């Protein structure tokens, strides 16, 4: 059959640097009839559809930046991005169309940027949820880098939690993360202080945000 393989699985590059990525096919994609390689590259930005960048191995689609260049022949192909931009954050796929079509497994390009501390916000449960017997406390850890981060919840001073990180931001190359603590109303009502504490490598001091139920 025709097996398409890509490398690396993922890598991160700083804005302005060069990105190199590879695509292999189990058999030659060089069509003897037209003497072209039936190999195309697609870019898929977070939560977007794939978009054509390059086809016939090296032909850059109109509207696609000069910084994207496809190369290689036969079984081996390379996508090169010079002077990478923040907006270039995406999974990049190669695809043969020599015999039906087959996509490679993709290469995830992340953007390296300077370390940035998160902005932390805590939100008490809404009365419209409380009416119903539940109490979700939410903390946003917004616009930080790098991705690793620790969140602790403290209720009246001591430590049902859902965490979610966003994809990397296509503009400032930051990540954000939400932490949601869900309690019953009966349990929420037993305690006064609710605290989320974010520890990130940007500071040895956790960022602490809190509210007290008596102050609501």
């Amino acid at each position: 059959d025709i097996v398409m393989s890509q490398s690396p699985s993922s890598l991160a590059v700083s804005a302005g640097e060069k990105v190199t990525m590879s695509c292999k096919s189990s058999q030659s994609l060089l069509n003897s009839r037209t003497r072209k390689n039936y190999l195309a590259w697609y870019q898929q930005k977070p939560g977007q559809s794939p978009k054509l960048l390059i086809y016939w191995a090296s032909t850059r689609e109109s509207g696609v930046p000069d910084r994207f260049t496809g190369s290689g022949s036969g079984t081996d192909f390379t996508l090169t991005i010079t002077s990478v931009q923040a907006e270039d954050l995406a999974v990049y796929y190669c695809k043969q169309s020599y015999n039906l079509r087959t996509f490679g497994g993709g290469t995830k390009l992340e953007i390296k940027r300077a370390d940035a501390a998160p902005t932390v916000s805590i939100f008490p449960p809404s009365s419209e949820q409380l009416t119903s017997g539940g109490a979700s406390v939410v903390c946003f850890l917004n616009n930080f880098y790098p991705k690793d981060i620790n969140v602790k919840w403290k209720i009246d001073g001591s430590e049902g939690v859902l965490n979610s990180w966003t994809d990397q931001d296509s503009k400032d190359s930051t990540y954000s993360m939400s932490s949601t603590l869900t309690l019953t109303k009966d349990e929420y009502e037993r305690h006064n202080s609710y605290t989320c504490e974010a520890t990130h490598k940007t500071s040895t001091s956790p960022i602490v945000k809190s509210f007290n139920r008596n102050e609501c």
């Binding site: 195309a40 054509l52 016939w56 996509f103 939100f123």
Partner: protein, 214 residues
Amino acid sequence: EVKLVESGGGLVQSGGSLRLSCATSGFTFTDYYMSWVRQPPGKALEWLGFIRNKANGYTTEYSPSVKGRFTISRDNSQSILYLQMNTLRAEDSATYYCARDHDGYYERFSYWGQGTLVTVSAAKTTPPSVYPLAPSMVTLGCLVKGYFPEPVTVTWNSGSLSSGVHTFPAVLQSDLYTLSSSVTVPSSTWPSETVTCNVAHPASSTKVDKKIVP
């Protein structure tokens, strides 16, 4: 302007069937092969099959992963592409894209639709509960809690607030999804001006506006 727009995805039980459509415009439909490609959440693109152009008899081909079980057809009067899916299984859960394919000259998929999400599950449809997240700059949110299946859409001020917005990917917990969205605006602008999250959950036809009130 070339347009492709898939519809028809949502929740279906194991063993059931489902038919997707892809409305096209802006190009000579019959000149073109058309393909379907799917993508399970967080995974790679998978080519599924194509239907050829007029010059080639509108014949069909399929990946072995789906041959015998999926069927591609086309309406040449209305420029609509179809995918018939039968005997669906868990692994068929995915975003389905239609893409414009070969014209006899170029080797490329030039255009792709926005995608339609198919979920294969025995779980019931459950609409979301939508809760406000209120406390130089101020960060507000909406919590979109306890829904199934994916997806939901979240906008802010019917889309006029687009900068300083992010939506946190949904997390599945005990058979339901929850997600949240943040919006950051100048504190001189809220609560003095209105901030509202607009939430839709197509599977239950849920439409919600939630004003963030101080």
